[PDB]
Amino acid sequence: DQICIGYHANNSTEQVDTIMEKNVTVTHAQDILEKTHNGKLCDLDGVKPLILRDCSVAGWLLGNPMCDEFINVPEWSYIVEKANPANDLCYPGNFNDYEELKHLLSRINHFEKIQIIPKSSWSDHEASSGVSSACPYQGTPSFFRNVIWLIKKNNTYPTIKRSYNNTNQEDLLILWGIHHSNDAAEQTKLYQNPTTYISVGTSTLNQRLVPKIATRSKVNGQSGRMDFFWTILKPNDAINFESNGNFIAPEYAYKIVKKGDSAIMKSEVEYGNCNTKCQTPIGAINSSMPFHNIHPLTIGECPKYVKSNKLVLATGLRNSP
Amino acid sequence: DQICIGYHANNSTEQVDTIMEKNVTVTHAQDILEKTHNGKLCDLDGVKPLILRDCSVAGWLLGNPMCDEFINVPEWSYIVEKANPANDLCYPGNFNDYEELKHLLSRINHFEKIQIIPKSSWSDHEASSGVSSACPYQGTPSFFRNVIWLIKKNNTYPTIKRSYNNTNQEDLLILWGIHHSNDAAEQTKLYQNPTTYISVGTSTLNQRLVPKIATRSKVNGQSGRMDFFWTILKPNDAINFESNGNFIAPEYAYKIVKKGDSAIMKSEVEYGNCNTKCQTPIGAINSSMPFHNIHPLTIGECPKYVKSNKLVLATGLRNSP
Amino acid sequence: DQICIGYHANNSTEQVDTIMEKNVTVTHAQDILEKTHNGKLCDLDGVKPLILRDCSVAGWLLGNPMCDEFINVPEWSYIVEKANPANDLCYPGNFNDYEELKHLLSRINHFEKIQIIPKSSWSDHEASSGVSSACPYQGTPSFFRNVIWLIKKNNTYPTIKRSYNNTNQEDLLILWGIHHSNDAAEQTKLYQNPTTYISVGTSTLNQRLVPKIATRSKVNGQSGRMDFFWTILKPNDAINFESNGNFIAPEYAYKIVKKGDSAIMKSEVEYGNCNTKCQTPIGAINSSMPFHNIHPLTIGECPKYVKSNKLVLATGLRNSP
Amino acid sequence: AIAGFIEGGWQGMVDGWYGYHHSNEQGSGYAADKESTQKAIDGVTNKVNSIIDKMNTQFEAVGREFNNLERRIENLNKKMEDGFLDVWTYNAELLVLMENERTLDFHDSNVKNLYDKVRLQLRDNAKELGNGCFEFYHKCDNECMESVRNGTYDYPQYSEEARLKREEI
Amino acid sequence: AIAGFIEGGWQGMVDGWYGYHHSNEQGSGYAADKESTQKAIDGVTNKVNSIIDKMNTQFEAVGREFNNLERRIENLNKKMEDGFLDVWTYNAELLVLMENERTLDFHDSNVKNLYDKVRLQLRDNAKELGNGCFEFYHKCDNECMESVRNGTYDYPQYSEEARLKREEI
Amino acid sequence: AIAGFIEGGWQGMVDGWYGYHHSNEQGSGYAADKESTQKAIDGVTNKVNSIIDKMNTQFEAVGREFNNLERRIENLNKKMEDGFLDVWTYNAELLVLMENERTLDFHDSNVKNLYDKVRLQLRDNAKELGNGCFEFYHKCDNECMESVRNGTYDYPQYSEEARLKREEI
């Protein structure tokens, strides 16, 4: 007559690693490493991303004519750019403080394009004549939608002195630019005056720009350059433009409410109408595990990224053969 | 006759958590999380802080007329600024490399204001009538005490050529400024000359400034701007100022020694004549347990910050009651 | 007749610490803290470093007359600088974006100096008269070898308009400069023209510099300044210089391809014709322990730097006979 | 033919983690000890849930944007994130190793505690067979075996009955 | 009777951590094992002092000095601050959980060793009651009890009486 | 003739980590239990190799390169480096402490299981002396001793002379 003590055994071959033992098979186990994503791009706490397919943020803001598909969304949690968007700046040049702006627009609570200086209102200058082959609209020569390339009218370019008081209740994002011409002949053909400037002043801003008239290599067929600038005009403050040439004036500013930081995501994966609290450039993550090995560049409350393939915790006993 | 084996028990109600046991009552326990500050602002290794009440570092350096002399502070361990000091720059403008300077003055070993360009020595220029209503000292218009707003005398502004050799053997912090006026009429009413400059030269410094004459928003009732600059003049080197207008000249420099690196703390907590090896914007901390949850922005040899309510270590036996 | 169970004891006096016990003697132990280096400087995965004797990166690229020893090597893994080289810019001035360049040049895969604008080809300007006492080679007034200090010839300085198309198919590192003179008279002794400029244009670059004529302290006996600039000219793009004075033109460029990234270590220890996968400024370390305490500024695949004297693991038993 | 704990696990014991197995005249079978099993299940799932629920998770966005002359700050960001990856990978890999070693020792200790419990109860009325089993010095029927698993085993009943068989050997 | 460790702790014992409780003709009382508990106190305070003393603190000043066109560098500094926060809390919480488990097992193993050291001595001269207690088969005056805690108990010297008191059932 | 488990180690035993020490009338000697010591050697060298092999080593270059108006970014780099230094030292020191504690208990546990593995064979044919030794109640030659180290001890065959020696006290 015998009585015996013993433990469970089953049909399991899941193995775990010990600090002194290698490949130990156990009854039950639990993996705490996430390695599954849904392959698509989704919202983030019920707020959709701003997906700019093929358009850079600069082109979207300025309105590259070859983009034009998106200034309608009032709120987003992150921005989706392709690794190297095709439509950045049709006319060559540089965007001042570009990355700082892109970070600022990483996550916007309320965003509303408005017109601040109507194209109609250019009495003494040529509004509808600032076009170029480098920024074409379906074959025809154009320019950025949201800024106006002013030109001399009736062989004159009288000194502009425009101002704007932000009567809105939100902050206003205004952009403008300056055109570096190539020689005195072009300079005076475009703007009548030879030596020009741009003064831009708010409470914070105290800027004056002079065009660099030199010779460069041609880019998108053009050897001129156009440099763009931006500012956040606080409510009730006023911006003062002044210029006798080479001005790229604003038509539209952007109402802006920032209550959060986020980060731009370079991805080609397509949106899939799915919500998550964690997102990667190759898919979303719906997990509660502490670790993942999917992708390092996450946005959201994510598990900590590891460079591991398994993280199995033994839960059962040792399995017998 | 019997003999039993057993262990201690008491009236303790301290509970600890296990990896596989929750809320376990133990005999003895030890919390290793610091959570108690002294509610006051105190010394840091026996050196008192620089508390700038409602004065920004800029106002204190330049001598905003509404900021006490109190040079009777020769050394400090950190600087206490209020969140948003009321008296920063009475006359609107910009302080160049301001944050980098604040980092340099975080912990200063020796600091002594000196006269380098006596106000008397401004003979061919009007020294004592460069004041404004935006910088009122006692209901009457005044101006920064440590820099002087030079003005034309007898309808002339002869171009200046001043120099200063650091005859000391400590580094010198020198400041100056430039006044952006609003139009040619104002410009020539203050400095007869219409196109002006400020060239400043050192062994390293090679600066040339031109005033930006534009129209800008009124700020503290004034629509001019004043941009300030700074430099460290090494011992035996010399600074050379040169200017024909819009100059905001130095009167006082500051002897400075720096054998460390501290931070600026934004706190409202009053000084408490206390000494500490670790300080937070709501109070100091004594015991060096390894962890604390008081405040992330600490200065000094602090315990590691965590997001924990308690970190209790069992030390005794399981309690039976 | 007895039988007893027991364990091994030996002549070991190695000690290990426990979380509950201190100074415990064991039979066998294993130290997992590396504490031994070479004392020399070595290759990095079969790639030699770039040792700069007293010459700085600035002096090396520009071609300072007092350090022409290392002008051969086309491949390196990192750069070795002396803590404070004595030969960097013999003529006082500034090197724009210097730290960014030496990060870029921290580890170069292929590097080949080439001539792009031969000195002979300055037909209308004086090339061979741009020397000074601040840059002595052979006791005779010299100047940087890789850039040409042009000055007026036959009392004229015609506007230079030179260009260079990147015919190679690796990137080109091009440098140039500007000479800040001391007064109008000197300015017109070297150049004819009193007001001057330098236009430099590529596809990305849109630069124009004007000389800053001010009064500054003498450095290496000279009170003029020379500011240098650089750019990466991509294949097929062209650089366009234009200037009527104060120009410091390039003679040689540098073919450059970099894939990996390294860092500039300051050390005076000599090269020992040895390889390693991890290197410190006091010697290399050829170990696979997880931790080391040799030196924090390591470069390569090194172990974790800790602040410990020993990290011994017990492997044997308690040694108690 | 019957096995024991010292011998390995029992695949035909499917209603718990640690249990018992007898062999009398009326037949053999397995029975699981519930308290010991529930106690282990609770401990192990509490351990896993501690490993998981003690993780502080903050909202953070990893993406990076620095320009072509901000390579040093990009490199600094890289170092920072690489450093946290090394830290997290090492700590997670070694945490699971340590706690797996401890979970297996937990099972072993639980199994040996159960064996000690019945070792105290039988005293001299059974022979420890040196393999997790006790060979009774008397007869114990399938009901009589509930008692030993019941912790309610009456020693008295067989004191002398057992004494006789041990003396006849 | 009066019960031992298996059924909880002893409020009555106040001059140590682990010890013995006897009752015999001349009376009952607790006596602590002043030596074993001294080392236990040493071990656990060494554990606590290692968790505190092995943290080197560096003088560091966490501050935030960045302007509105350096928001990216603030965000990087903030990423760093949060990463170190997550690392330190997760490790501090798991350290305290792990070593609390460890400490409680250290106390359990020590008092089971104290029980084993007298079970081995007493042998057949006493009956294990299954609760940390032994009922002697003989009479055991105060020096016999100090012998048992001493580890110097004469088995032989009480074999006789005990054998009887046992042959008594 | 010398002691065992409760007591110290044996400099005389040099062919393993754990083993046996016999004394009989034909002489005395040590012999290592090679199956126990190999397992332990494998386990602890696996412990060391886990501590070492699970380190993620990436190529990184620590270099301080910021100018005189980049002191804030320098200070940030310094905060970061220092934080990683503090984390790694705390984790490494406590890892070795905790694992050193576990390595020594492991050795102790192995010793006590070997003692149990021969106690369960010897049973009444020997006297537990409370120091890792068994005094045989009969005579045990060198082949009897290797029977017991092998686990092939014929209890029964010695009960003959044992019960007689026991009764003789």
Ligand SMILES: *[C@@H]1O[C@H](CO)[C@@H](O[C@@H]2O[C@H](CO)[C@@H](O[C@@H]3O[C@H](CO)[C@@H](O)[C@H](O)[C@@H]3O)[C@H](O)[C@H]2NC(C)=O)[C@H](O)[C@H]1NC(C)=O
């Ligand atoms: C942008 O427009 C707003 C108004 O739409 C300007 O703010 C206005 O400033 C005026 C003059 O300071 C204020 O009127 C004054 O009111 C005070 C008492 O409040 C009175 O003592 C004065 O006699 C005068 O009537 C007015 O309150 C204020 N309005 C609002 C709504 O703020 C603002 O100044 C403009 N922007 C710029 C750059 O000026």
Ligand SMILES: *[C@@H]1O[C@H](CO)[C@@H](O[C@@H]2O[C@H](CO)[C@@H](O[C@@H]3O[C@H](CO)[C@@H](O)[C@H](O)[C@@H]3O)[C@H](O)[C@H]2NC(C)=O)[C@H](O)[C@H]1NC(C)=O
């Ligand atoms: C600021 O003033 C100081 C003091 O005059 C200047 O330093 C001085 O420089 C002079 C020469 O320019 C030195 O005189 C010579 O020194 C050499 C040694 O290098 C010696 O061999 C000669 O016989 C002669 O004495 C003088 O030592 C030195 N004085 C001091 C106090 O350091 C400095 O140049 C001025 N700063 C500038 C940039 O103007």
Ligand SMILES: *[C@@H]1O[C@H](CO)[C@@H](O[C@@H]2O[C@H](CO)[C@@H](O[C@@H]3O[C@H](CO)[C@@H](O)[C@H](O)[C@@H]3O)[C@H](O)[C@H]2NC(C)=O)[C@H](O)[C@H]1NC(C)=O
């Ligand atoms: C630097 O020199 C290179 C080579 O001379 C220049 O690139 C060349 O650009 C011309 C455009 O005029 C290309 O010619 C074109 O060829 C295509 C066929 O591929 C043809 O369809 C067009 O009608 C035209 O003939 C030429 O292929 C191209 N060469 C290379 C190798 O890219 C470059 O433009 C110069 N740098 C600058 C500043 O432009």
Ligand SMILES: *[C@@H]1O[C@H](CO)[C@@H](O[C@@H]2O[C@H](CO)[C@@H](O)[C@H](O)[C@H]2NC(C)=O)[C@H](O)[C@H]1NC(C)=O
């Ligand atoms: C291993 O055994 C498990 C559990 O016995 C099997 O899982 C199921 O077993 C139940 C019996 O109650 C049945 O529903 C099915 O036979 C199984 N269903 C599924 C989907 O698993 C499991 O299949 C076994 N694995 C193998 C293939 O050995």
Ligand SMILES: *[C@@H]1O[C@H](CO)[C@@H](O[C@@H]2O[C@H](CO)[C@@H](O)[C@H](O)[C@H]2NC(C)=O)[C@H](O)[C@H]1NC(C)=O
């Ligand atoms: C532990 O088990 C794993 C997987 O079963 C082993 O991985 C081996 O992987 C190689 C392919 O690279 C193949 O030989 C087999 O897939 C695996 N071999 C085995 C053991 O089946 C791993 O090697 C094992 N650990 C040890 C000690 O080798």
Ligand SMILES: *[C@@H]1O[C@H](CO)[C@@H](O[C@@H]2O[C@H](CO)[C@@H](O)[C@H](O)[C@H]2NC(C)=O)[C@H](O)[C@H]1NC(C)=O
């Ligand atoms: C272009 O500008 C010229 C000069 O401003 C205009 O000619 C003048 O027009 C003004 C106002 O209509 C008259 O008062 C003058 O008598 C004109 N002067 C001369 C000499 O012509 C002209 O009208 C403008 N051209 C167009 C097409 O608008």
Ligand SMILES: *[C@@H]1O[C@H](CO)[C@@H](O[C@@H]2O[C@H](CO)[C@@H](O)[C@H](O)[C@H]2NC(C)=O)[C@H](O)[C@H]1NC(C)=O
């Ligand atoms: C828990 O017990 C402790 C110790 O008995 C109590 O603390 C002491 O209380 C006694 C009263 O008998 C006083 O003599 C002492 O002044 C107290 N301190 C010391 C030195 O022990 C404590 O009061 C008890 N807690 C509760 C729940 O009352």
Ligand SMILES: *[C@@H]1O[C@H](CO)[C@@H](O[C@@H]2O[C@H](CO)[C@@H](O)[C@H](O)[C@H]2NC(C)=O)[C@H](O)[C@H]1NC(C)=O
């Ligand atoms: C562990 O004990 C703590 C404190 O004694 C408990 O904390 C609170 O307990 C009350 C009653 O159970 C609840 O109303 C609160 O919600 C508890 N707070 C927390 C933090 O949970 C706690 O309940 C006990 N364990 C748990 C997790 O319930």
Ligand SMILES: *[C@@H]1O[C@H](CO)[C@@H](O[C@@H]2O[C@H](CO)[C@@H](O)[C@H](O)[C@H]2NC(C)=O)[C@H](O)[C@H]1NC(C)=O
């Ligand atoms: C301002 O300067 C003028 C002219 O310099 C002073 O008038 C005098 O004119 C003479 C000769 O032109 C100058 O040499 C002197 O500067 C002046 N002195 C005299 C009395 O001749 C004038 O006095 C100065 N300021 C004012 C307003 O008096």
Ligand SMILES: *[C@@H]1O[C@H](CO)[C@@H](O[C@@H]2O[C@H](CO)[C@@H](O)[C@H](O)[C@H]2NC(C)=O)[C@H](O)[C@H]1NC(C)=O
């Ligand atoms: C500790 O033990 C080692 C065993 O390796 C000793 O080394 C031997 O001891 C002496 C030489 O010192 C000779 O008997 C042997 O030839 C040595 N070699 C070996 C491999 O045994 C060591 O000497 C001992 N400690 C001291 C201080 O001597």
Ligand SMILES: *[C@@H]1O[C@H](CO)[C@@H](O[C@@H]2O[C@H](CO)[C@@H](O)[C@H](O)[C@H]2NC(C)=O)[C@H](O)[C@H]1NC(C)=O
């Ligand atoms: C063994 O003891 C020594 C000395 O106590 C320890 O080394 C340190 O020595 C310094 C100076 O003599 C003492 O102030 C410290 O107390 C010791 N440090 C520590 C960590 O206690 C040594 O660390 C101890 N352990 C080992 C492994 O030898």
Ligand SMILES: *[C@@H]1O[C@H](CO)[C@@H](O[C@@H]2O[C@H](CO)[C@@H](O)[C@H](O)[C@H]2NC(C)=O)[C@H](O)[C@H]1NC(C)=O
């Ligand atoms: C220096 O320049 C002068 C002035 O140009 C040269 O003299 C004239 O050179 C031009 C062409 O450069 C000729 O057309 C003239 O015939 C020359 N003289 C006259 C009267 O204009 C002079 O030759 C140059 N000197 C040198 C050394 O070449």
Ligand SMILES: *[C@@H]1O[C@H](CO)[C@@H](O)[C@H](O)[C@H]1NC(C)=O
């Ligand atoms: C996804 O998230 C939901 C909650 O929104 C959760 O209940 C569900 O189980 C998750 N699905 C997956 C992929 O596990």
Ligand SMILES: *[C@@H]1O[C@H](CO)[C@@H](O)[C@H](O)[C@H]1NC(C)=O
């Ligand atoms: C505070 O720290 C001081 C040393 O700085 C120490 O002497 C004292 O014990 C501490 N005070 C308490 C009890 O918090």
Ligand SMILES: *[C@@H]1O[C@H](CO)[C@@H](O)[C@H](O)[C@H]1NC(C)=O
């Ligand atoms: C040095 O590194 C080499 C790799 O080239 C390696 O094979 C060897 O183990 C190392 N030698 C030592 C430990 O000195």
